[PDB]
Amino acid sequence: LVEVADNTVDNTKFVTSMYNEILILGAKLHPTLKLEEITNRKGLTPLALAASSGKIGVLAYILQREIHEPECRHLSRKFTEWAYGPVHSSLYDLSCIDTCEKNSVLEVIAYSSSETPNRHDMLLVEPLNRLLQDKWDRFVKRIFYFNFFVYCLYMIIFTAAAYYRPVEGLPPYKLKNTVGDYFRVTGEILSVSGGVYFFFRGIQYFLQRRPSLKSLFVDSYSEILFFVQSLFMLVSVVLYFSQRKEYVASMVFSLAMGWTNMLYYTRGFQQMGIYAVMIEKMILRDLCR
Amino acid sequence: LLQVGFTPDGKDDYRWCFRVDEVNWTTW
Amino acid sequence: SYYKGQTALHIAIERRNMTLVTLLVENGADVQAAANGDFFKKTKGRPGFYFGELPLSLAACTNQLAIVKFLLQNSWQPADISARDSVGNTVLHALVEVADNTVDNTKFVTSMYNEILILGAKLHPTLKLEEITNRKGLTPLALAASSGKIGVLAYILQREIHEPECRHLSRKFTEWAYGPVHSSLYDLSCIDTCEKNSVLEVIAYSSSETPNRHDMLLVEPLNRLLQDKWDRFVKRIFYFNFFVYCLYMIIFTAAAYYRPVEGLPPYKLKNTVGDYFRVTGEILSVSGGVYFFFRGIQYFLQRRPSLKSLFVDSYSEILFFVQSLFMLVSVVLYFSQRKEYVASMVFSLAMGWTNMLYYTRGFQQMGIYAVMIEKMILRDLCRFMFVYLVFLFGFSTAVVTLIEDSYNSLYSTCLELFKFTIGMGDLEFTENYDFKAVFIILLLAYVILTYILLLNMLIALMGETVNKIAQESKNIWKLQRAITILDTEKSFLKCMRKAFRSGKLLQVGFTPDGKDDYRWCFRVDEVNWTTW
Amino acid sequence: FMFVYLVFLFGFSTAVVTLIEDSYNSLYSTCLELFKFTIGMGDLEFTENYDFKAVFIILLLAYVILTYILLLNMLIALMGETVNKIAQESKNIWKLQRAITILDTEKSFLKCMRKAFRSGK
Ligand SMILES: C=C(C)[C@]12C[C@@H](C)[C@@]34O[C@](Cc5ccccc5)(O[C@@H]1[C@@H]3C=C(COC(=O)Cc1ccc(O)c(OC)c1)C[C@]1(O)C(=O)C(C)=C[C@@H]41)O2
Ligand SMILES: C=C(C)[C@]12C[C@@H](C)[C@@]34O[C@](Cc5ccccc5)(O[C@@H]1[C@@H]3C=C(COC(=O)Cc1ccc(O)c(OC)c1)C[C@]1(O)C(=O)C(C)=C[C@@H]41)O2
């Protein structure tokens, strides 16, 4: 019933109605068993299937499914606490919406391939929008701002240690006995440590997701760019340990990438996001072809 | 994490919840 | 707190229970008591619905005309139409803010407002309920005008009641209708120069958050009154203001052009006609500076605008204050015996000349250019500079680090790459810098990324802005004219006193108390023959 | 749009020439150099050692951003709207011009109208 849906008002209404009827009848026949917990070969429930395949009608039905019938209450997903007037307090189940299993509605909508048609409008469904806003206001916001602040500091140190690179002799360079030399070597170490961190982050992301080659750039632009910056710094340090003057040619690439990559954090504001999105599409659709 | 209903099997069910509110007065 | 004072009467009223609400009062329940709580208060932080604290206010705001009528005429304890809650908003206030600016809701709220007004007048002809203000000290008319409730404002301004017993209630009086023409008389009792708040003075000084302010001035009496004011005395005062500022700019330019270049400031007044003219010009310039300084300070004290809306709604005032500031600093440094007065003086002068776009607000066709330049500098350019500077600084640190062994200093790299952004660069690739291929790759990437991608991105965004704020030119112009008229009227008290804002001061009806009422009026006419 | 542009040009050029009265020697040459700045044919040399160099740089960078980028593209968008408006309805635009041409040609020569036999019959 989930995949037979075609995302039209008539078909969605019909499929949801008959889904309700079959669910009620099965519950009447077999109250002991619950049919919504059984997964297919891919190991995802009908709720997860509807969320993943873009079936916005079925997902909207299941998420806020309210059954008023007294004998059928455990079936209801959303409970209406009270309604004094225009306000109507409601309680949503959230039983398998966040941190539920290897698959969940949020974790599946977020990690779509961009082929899904309704992913942009899928997050508009009441419980998901409210839950995401609550998460953002609760603890995610300050962690994001701390992440942005630390990367801003890392870019400042990377820029300063790149600006004052010694110009006399061939690499490596003996650690001169001075405060300035100590600061320069500390800055180099901080830069390379950031490089290793970003390298492992990128590798583990690519192992987890394992994106298809065609959709490697449509949906992982920023991850590709952070991996490329880390790669260039890694090659630079390798060539600096290999006693060649050609570490700077890779280092400038790494640094300009590093600075233009703070457009990744413009994703956190409502007004400033589009500039970071335009630059992406305009470089992949138009310019490339 | 509250229990808001009773299962047909007679055992109380405890489930997570997330209270929300909305405004719609055009329907009276 | 949450339920403070809340009783089953409130639920029955909100549940549209005809009898239960009746039974509560029949038993002896008193409605004069009110329920106040965080849920009832008008707070956006938490869910709530403000219908007023008075139970009569609750019943009225809940669309129950029969029940409120019964309560008002209830024998046991009639509800007090004049009751005011802790906030101050009486029933009329509550009806005003409960409006949501929709055809159905506006029609309903206006209709029930009329019914309650007529009923109260019947009960208490002696008292008039529309003159009582809330804690903020503004009437329901002023509340509707301020909060953007265009439906309620349009209702109250042109409220015509044909009923013979209810005539003093009517705001607009129709003198006669020979045909398509229908002479009308509007009250104007509290529309201009009424109190510390008035409909015009409140619409003009909105925060731009109000949705209908541009379309609020379209209401008949206000548009007619503003046009009459503009045609009567405001127009020549505006043109005299523009002429005097044009002369002040000419003198400021001439005395700035012929500044002495020998020695350090101050300069001894040479015995000549030219020197006398130069010192006279300097004095005229500084006097203009003091005038603009005090004008700006008094404006900022009167309005006291919020920091966020300091630039959205006071662009021109900020610019005039900044010009005055630069001249003041220039004169201070000229009295401090430093040659650095000219550096501030040129800023002051270019500001002065480009500020005559303020007076382009007075023409219909020329206004938009002064409006575009504003939005395009505050919305687009400001936030696009963040996007551009990460690019410029990243690529310039990159470039200067590459060839540290035109592009010598970080400043010169910044300048050369800015000219690359705006199409005035030259890709010479002549001098033999180290790592030439990497240098070429960097700057070609930079040109394609900024000159082609980013610059045209900005150009398309600004074109969208221009397209957006060029279609609706009339609305853009009319509000600027309204603010100009209000400020000109307020500048000179005798100007308003002898302007005779109202068309006439006539008595057109008799009050229920039997004493003739004399009120201001402003005759208007209109044409509509499709209705026969 | 020339009214809007000339306040900018004259204010900024009086400003520039007053600053460095101690290419940019005469007010005429300031006007010409800044007009080429408006239409993208200027050069920000910043070479000769004028007094108050930082203020000079700030003035001309402000001028370029304000006129070359903001104002010129404002005008270009406005003219594009004009072209868009009067290019959609080409047939109407043409037919009236043809009508006036026909009327004037007919009126120019009286014998032309006399022997033209305006009416079919
Ligand atoms: C992986 C890819 C596509 C990419 C890596 C480098 C080589 C890149 O050139 C490109 C190809 C290119 C080059 C020049 C013009 C257009 C495209 O585009 C980016 C890439 C293109 C630019 C612009 O990058 C952006 O779009 C900013 C951005 C937008 C949204 C984001 O979420 C984001 O996250 C990091 C970054 C920056 C560079 O990385 C950079 O700083 C320099 C010196 C090279 C640019 O290759
Ligand atoms: C208070 C603000 C915003 C402002 C003051 C000065 C510094 C200003 O640069 C800005 C920032 C700026 C600079 C360069 C390009 C864009 C923006 O914009 C104006 C300000 C921007 C310009 C353009 O001003 C205008 O928009 C004209 C104008 C339009 C509508 C008006 O109602 C108006 O009333 C006075 C003026 C003129 C300057 O004041 C000027 O003449 C010079 C030399 C500096 C310009 O700062």
Cβ distance of A159 and C397 shorter than 8 Å = yes
Rounded Cα–Cα distance for residues A37 and C414 (Å): 61
Q: A84: which chain C residues are within 8 Å (Cβ-Cβ)?
A: 11, 14, 39, 49
Distance of CA A245 to the CA centre of its chain: 39
**Contact status, residue D69 vs residue D36, Cβ threshold 8 Å:** no
Take residue C226 and report the two structure tokens written for it. 């503003």
Peptide bond preceding A86: is omega within 30 degrees of 0, i.e. cis? no
Rounded Cα–Cα distance for residues C322 and C203 (Å): 27
Take residue C203 and report the two structure tokens written for it. 């619409």
D22 is in an annotated binding site: no
Distance of CA D53 to the CA centre of its chain: 31
* φ/ψ (deg, to 5) at C504: -160, 170
Q: Does the CB atom of residue A256 touch ligand 1 within 6 A?
A: yes
Rounded Cα–Cα distance for residues A154 and A180 (Å): 18
Cβ distance of C349 and D15 shorter than 8 Å = yes
Question: Which is it for the CA torsion D5, D11, D16, D17, positive or negative?
Answer: positive
Residue C294: HSE in the Cβ half-sphere, 13 Å Cα cutoff: 5
H/E element, C382: helix C381-402
Chain B CA closest to residue A76:
B5
**Contact status, residue C110 vs residue C60, Cβ threshold 8 Å:** no
Rounded Cα–Cα distance for residues D47 and C250 (Å): 32
Q: Does the CB atom of residue A228 touch ligand 1 within 6 A?
A: yes
At residue C522, the 3 state secondary structure works out as strand
Pairs of CB atoms within 8 A across A/C: 86
Residue in this structure with the two tokens 């696009």, named with its chain if needed? C384
D104 is in an annotated binding site: no
Pairs of CB atoms within 8 A across A/B: 58
H/E element, B18: strand B18-20
Take residue A19 and report the two structure tokens written for it. 């889904």
Q: A70-79: which pairs have CB atoms within 8 A and are 24 or more residues apart?
A: A72/A24, A72/A27, A73/B5, A73/B6, A74/B5, A74/B6, A74/B7, A74/B8, A74/B13, A75/A23, A75/A24, A75/A27, A76/B5, A78/A127, A79/B4, A79/B5, A79/B17
Rounded Cα–Cα distance for residues C392 and C399 (Å): 10
Neighbors of chain C with 3 or more C-beta pairs under 8 Å: A, B, D
H/E element, C299: helix C273-303
Rounded Cα–Cα distance for residues C48 and C62 (Å): 14
Q: Cβ-count burial of C360 within 10 angstroms (0-12 exposed, 13-18 middle, 19+ buried)? A: buried
**Interrupted backbone of chain C, residues before each interruption (C–N > 2.5 Å):** 405
Query: Do A and D make contact, counting contact as 3+ CB pairs within 8 angstroms?
Result: no
Start-to-end CA span in chain C (Å): 58
DSSP label of A96:
T
In degrees, to the nearest 5, what angle opens at C-alpha D31 toward C-alphas D27 and D36? 150
Cβ distance of B23 and C104 shorter than 8 Å = no
C5 is in an annotated binding site: yes
Short-list C521, B6, C442, C397, CA closest to A259: C397
Question: Which is it for the CA torsion D99, D100, D101, D105, positive or negative?
Answer: positive
Q: Which of B5, B15, B23 sits opposite A95 (nearest CB)?
A: B15
A73 is in an annotated binding site: no
Strand-pair category, A89-92 with C172-176: unpaired
**Contact status, residue A246 vs residue C436, Cβ threshold 8 Å:** no
Cβ distance of B18 and A92 shorter than 8 Å = yes
In angstroms, what is the span from residue C357 Cα to ligand 2's centroid?
11
Pairs of CB atoms within 8 A across B/C: 7
Q: Does the CB atom of residue A221 touch ligand 1 within 6 A?
A: yes
Rounded Cα–Cα distance for residues C145 and C285 (Å): 41
Cβ count within 10 A of residue A56: 21
Rounded Cα–Cα distance for residues C78 and C74 (Å): 5
Cβ distance of C376 and D70 shorter than 8 Å = yes
Chain C CA closest to residue A159:
C397
Peptide bond preceding C266: is omega within 30 degrees of 0, i.e. cis? yes
Cβ distance of A81 and B15 shorter than 8 Å = no
Take residue C371 and report the two structure tokens written for it. 């409006």
C15 is in an annotated binding site: yes
Q: Residues with Cβ within 6 A of ligand 2?
A: C 315-316, 318-319, 322, 347, 350-351, 354-355, 357-358, 370, 373-374, 377, 381; D 62, 65-66
Neighbors of chain B with 3 or more C-beta pairs under 8 Å: A, C
DSSP-derived secondary structure for D14-45: HHHHHHT----SSHHHHHHHHHHHHTT-----
Amino acid at the residue C139: T
Residues whose CB falls within 8 Å of the CB of residue C134, separated by 6 or more in sequence, listed in order: C84, C87, C88, C89, C90, C93, C143
Neighbors of chain D with 3 or more C-beta pairs under 8 Å: C
Cβ distance of B22 and A95 shorter than 8 Å = no
In degrees, to the nearest 5, what angle opens at C-alpha A156 toward C-alphas A154 and A162? 100
Best C353, C374, C381, C459 member to test D by mutation, with max D CBs in 10 Å, is: C353
Short-list C284, C301, C194, C302, CA closest to C247: C284
In angstroms, what is the span from residue C254 Cα to ligand 2's centroid?
22
Q: Cβ-count burial of A68 within 10 angstroms (0-12 exposed, 13-18 middle, 19+ buried)? A: exposed
Q: Does the CB atom of residue C449 touch ligand 1 within 6 A?
A: yes
Q: Which of C16, C47, C104 sits opposite B21 (nearest CB)?
A: C47
Give the gap in angstroms from C-alpha A80 to the nearest C-alpha of chain B: 9
**Contact status, residue B3 vs residue B15, Cβ threshold 8 Å:** yes
Rounded Cα–Cα distance for residues C325 and C293 (Å): 7
Rounded Cα–Cα distance for residues A152 and A157 (Å): 9
Strands in C141-275 per DSSP E:
172-176, 183-186
Q: Report which protein residue has its CA nearest ligand 2's atom 40.
A: C351
**Contact status, residue C152 vs residue C110, Cβ threshold 8 Å:** yes
Short-list C59, C64, C51, CA closest to C79: C59
Q: C13-19: which pairs have CB atoms within 8 A and are 24 or more residues apart?
A: C13/C55, C13/C58, C13/C59, C13/C62, C13/C64, C13/C67, C14/A84, C14/A85, C14/C58, C14/C62, C16/B28, C16/C62, C16/C64, C18/C66, C18/C67
Rounded Cα–Cα distance for residues D107 and D121 (Å): 21
Using a CB–CB cut-off of 8 Å, the residues of A that contact C are 84-87, 89, 159, 162-163, 165, 167, 246, 248-249, 251-253, 255-260, 262-263, 266, 271-272, 275-276, 278-279, 282-283, 287
Rounded Cα–Cα distance for residues A268 and A145 (Å): 9
Rounded Cα–Cα distance for residues C182 and C524 (Å): 8
Residue in this structure with the two tokens 């005539």, named with its chain if needed? C167
Using a CB–CB cut-off of 8 Å, the residues of C that contact A are 11, 14, 39, 47-49, 51, 62, 383-384, 386-387, 390-391, 393-395, 397-402, 404-405, 435, 438, 442, 448, 453-454, 457
Ligand in closest contact with the CA of D13: 2
Short-list A24, A14, A18, A12, CA closest to A50: A12
Q: Which of A249, A260, A266 sits opposite C438 (nearest CB)?
A: A249
Which residue out of C354, C376, C385 has the highest number of ligand 2 atoms within 8 Å of its CB and is therefore the one to mutate?
Answer: C354
Distances (CA, A) of D80 to A33, C367, C476, D85, D86: 68, 20, 21, 8, 10
Residues whose CB falls within 8 Å of the CB of residue C212, separated by 6 or more in sequence, listed in order: C101, C148, C150
Take residue C527 and report the two structure tokens written for it. 């044409």
Query: Do B and C make contact, counting contact as 3+ CB pairs within 8 angstroms?
Result: yes
DSSP label of C163:
-
At residue A74, the 3 state secondary structure works out as coil
Residues whose CB falls within 8 Å of the CB of residue A44, separated by 6 or more in sequence, listed in order: A52, A103, A108
Q: Cβ-count burial of A194 within 10 angstroms (0-12 exposed, 13-18 middle, 19+ buried)? A: buried
Residues whose CB falls within 8 Å of the CB of residue C405, separated by 6 or more in sequence, listed in order: A167, C433, C434
Rounded Cα–Cα distance for residues C216 and D90 (Å): 38
DSSP label of C523:
E
Rounded Cα–Cα distance for residues D1 and D82 (Å): 14
How many residues in total does chain C contain?
Answer: 532
Distance of CA D39 to the CA centre of its chain: 10
DSSP label of C527:
B
Residues whose CB falls within 8 Å of the CB of residue C315, separated by 6 or more in sequence, listed in order: C374, C378
At residue C520, the 3 state secondary structure works out as strand
Which residue out of A158, A206, A251, A260 has the highest number of ligand 1 atoms within 8 Å of its CB and is therefore the one to mutate?
Answer: A260
In degrees, to the nearest 5, what angle opens at C-alpha A118 toward C-alphas A116 and A124? 140
Q: D12: which chain C residues are within 8 Å (Cβ-Cβ)?
A: 350, 353-354
Amino acid at the residue C327: M
Q: What's the per-residue H, E or C state across C434-494?
A: CCHHHHHHHHHHHHHHHHHHHHHHHHHHHHHHHHHHHHCHHHHHHHHHHHHHHHHHHHCHH
Chain A CA closest to residue C438:
A249
Distance of CA A223 to the CA centre of its chain: 10
Helix runs in C103-204, H state only: 103-123, 140-146, 150-157, 199-204
Cβ distance of A287 and C404 shorter than 8 Å = no
DSSP label of B21:
-
H/E element, C517: strand C516-524
Take residue A105 and report the two structure tokens written for it. 């509605």
Q: Does the CB atom of residue C445 touch ligand 1 within 6 A?
A: yes
**Contact status, residue C368 vs residue C476, Cβ threshold 8 Å:** yes
Helix runs in chain A, H state only: 9-29, 46-52, 56-63, 105-110, 119-122, 126-135, 141-163, 179-209, 221-241, 247-260, 273-281
Q: Does the CB atom of residue A264 touch ligand 1 within 6 A?
A: yes
Distance of CA C197 to the CA centre of its chain: 14
Rounded Cα–Cα distance for residues D101 and D25 (Å): 53
